[PDB]
From TrEMBL, chain C:
It comes from Photorhabdus luminescens. This is TcdA1. Signal peptide: none annotated. The lineage of its organism: Bacteria, Pseudomonadati, Pseudomonadota, Gammaproteobacteria, Enterobacterales. Residues 20-144 form the Tc toxin complex TcA C-terminal TcB-binding domain.
Length: 146, 293, 146
């Protein structure tokens, strides 16, 4: 069942379950129980390679000072230059709104920490390619530069 | 079912003959009356048993995830039935399942599709619970086990049992009806098995020629080490005389009832140590009747 | 012909601009004697795009084959990310069991099409201003002779 979670996360088939409860039977001392799991794993590997295909590896730079500077005006648009250097000097306050807000930590140990939040819904990355290129888009690796 | 109080004299004589023949057959077979009644029984006990529970658990575990269009349900279900019901061969279980589907056992007519659907929906393995349909499931399982007791008691070969299940007409049962496990059918199945055993090594070719419409007098005479002219003339005499069911050249070696009639003629001729024309002359001596001269 | 440069036919590709070229016009089979070897097959196609991409800004473009049948599942197209000797993958390894994109493809026949999504300036496509700076395209064809 740990290999089945690995399958259900390397692919997206959260519904697909291959391990059945019938592998052990106390009537017959549980004999041949392992060979039923061996068949289940063989079915899991066969379906796994049957469904797997080469995916288009892509990378995209996000400029956070642009994602906040371009913020729709129903939220207050701001460049990070003029709020980082006052929410430090005041140690307090907030800027922006929704999931794109920039503000200090809520919890008692985070009260000093300053965290900048952004929504992937506003990165709008799904617009950058035709839809028929592929229906599911998934992160491989997030790298940060400061 | 017939009552002895209100019965005709000829009907009573026929009943006496039937009882004597069946008693003689049971004595030859070393069989008790209770065993014959069990093999010919139709009422089934509606009580769950550990053997039936194990059968249900094994079938449910094996058939889980089965796809209807990918393969036939009966063929997929056969191995688990063979494992649970203590069978030597898988195809014996497949033939038994076909026979049961034709019989539709129990008070609630049960079949493989209905059994599979009930197991898929209303069955929870490992727990003792009361289900309204569970008694019909038990009856169907009991019928399957009884048809095992049939197959093993008869001693017939697996492929001729398959032929009997699939084509009762070849065994001369009434056309268009499921084969009967009635004692009347049991005795003829036993006689067929005994004749196959008597054929010895030739049986392998004889049965293959019988399953096609291929078997002839000469091949069967070579198989039984009898004269071909003897079998041909016995068949001719059987065709000439009015049997019921009638014997015609296109069934004389195609239906088992015709082969059995011909073999009875041959046995009676060799008992009298005369040709079949001797028996033909004998049976003309109906001197105590008004039907004919 | 197959060397035309034109916009996409399908409803989602109507913004995308794709440049097609026939391997028959690359005429690569002429570059060596015939008796050196009768079959010539692609090992790896690499693309380079010397536009004036900005700092922390990138192109998106996608080069695809024409058959999509003869070849392993998903090996028929790779997408360029940054366009400087850039294939579709993040680390390429010739020792890996994976067939690289465009592997085993015959040189003599075939069509290669490179597409640029969101080109059309009437739709204010993200590439529109940068694609004007695009001068020329380079393919690096890794092919083997045997």
């Amino acid at each position: 069942l740990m290999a089945e979670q690995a399958y259900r996360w390397e692919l997206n088939d959260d519904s697909a379950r291959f391990i059945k409860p019938g592998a052990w039977q106390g009537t017959y001392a549980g004999l041949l129980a392992g060979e039923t799991l061996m068949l289940s794993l063989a079915q899991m590997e066969d379906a796994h390679l049957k469904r797997d295909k080469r995916a288009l590896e892509v990378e995209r730079t996000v400029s956070l000072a642009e994602v906040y500077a371009g913020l729709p005006k129903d939220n207050g648009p701001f460049s990070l230059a003029q709020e980082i250097d006052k929410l430090v000097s005041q140690g307090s306050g907030s800027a922006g709104s929704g999931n794109n807000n920039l503000a200090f930590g809520a919890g008692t140990d985070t009260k000093t920490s300053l965290q900048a939040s952004v929504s992937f819904a506003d990165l709008k990355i799904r617009e950058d390619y035709p839809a028929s290129l592929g229906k599911i888009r998934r992160i491989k690796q997030i790298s940060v530069t400061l | 079912k017939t009552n002895l109080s209100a019965i005709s004299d000829k009907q009573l004589a026929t009943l006496i003959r039937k009882l004597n023949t069946i008693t003689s057959w049971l004595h030859t077979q070393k069989w008790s009356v209770f065993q014959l009644f069990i093999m010919t029984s139709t009422s089934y006990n509606k009580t769950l048993t550990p053997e039936i529970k194990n059968l249900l658990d094994t079938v449910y575990h094996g058939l889980q995830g089965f796809d209807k269009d990918k393969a036939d349900l009966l063929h997929v279900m056969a191995p688990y039935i063979a494992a649970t019901l203590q069978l030597s061969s898988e195809n014996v279980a497949h033939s038994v399942l076909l026979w049961a589907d034709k019989l539709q056992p129990g008070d609630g007519a049960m079949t493989a599709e209905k059994f599979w659907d009930w197991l898929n929906t209303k069955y929870t393995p490992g727990s003792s619970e009361a289900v309204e349909t569970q008694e019909h499931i038990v009856q169907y399982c009991q019928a399957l086990a009884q048809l095992e007791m049939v197959y093993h008691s008869t001693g017939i070969n697996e492929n001729a049992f398959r032929l009997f299940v699939t084509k009762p007409e070849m065994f001369g049962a009434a056309t268009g009806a499921a084969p009967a496990h009635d004692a009347l059918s049991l005795i003829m199945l036993t006689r067929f098995a005994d004749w196959v055993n008597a054929l010895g090594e030739k049986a392998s070719s004889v049965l293959a020629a019988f399953e096609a419409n291929s078997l002839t007098a000469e091949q069967l005479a070579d198989a039984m080490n009898l004269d071909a002219n003897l079998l041909l003339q016995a068949s001719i005499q059987a065709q000439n005389h009015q049997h019921l069911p009638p014997v015609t050249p296109e069934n004389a070696f195609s239906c088992w009832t015709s082969i059995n009639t011909i073999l009875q003629w041959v046995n009676v001729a060799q008992q009298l140590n005369v040709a079949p024309q001797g028996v033909s002359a004998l049976v003309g001596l109906d001197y105590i009747q008004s039907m004919k001269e | 012909g197959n060397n035309n440069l034109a916009f996409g036919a399908g409803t989602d590709t109507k913004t995308s601009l794709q440049a097609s070229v026939s391997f028959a016009d690359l005429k690569i089979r002429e570059d060596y004697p015939a008796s050196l070897g009768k079959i010539r097959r692609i090992k790896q196609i690499s693309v380079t795009l010397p536009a004036l991409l900005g700092p922390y800004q990138d192109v998106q473009a996608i080069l695809s084959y024409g058959d999509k049948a003869g070849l392993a599942n998903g090996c028929e197209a790779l997408a360029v990310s940054h366009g400087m000797n850039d294939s579709g993958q993040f680390q390429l390894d010739f020792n890996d069991g994976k067939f690289l994109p465009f592997e085993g493809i015959a040189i003599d026949q075939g069509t290669l099409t490179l597409s640029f999504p969101n080109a059309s300036m009437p739709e204010k496509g993200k590439q529109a201003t940068m694609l004007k700076t695009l001068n020329d395209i380079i393919l690096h064809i890794r092919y083997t002779i045997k």
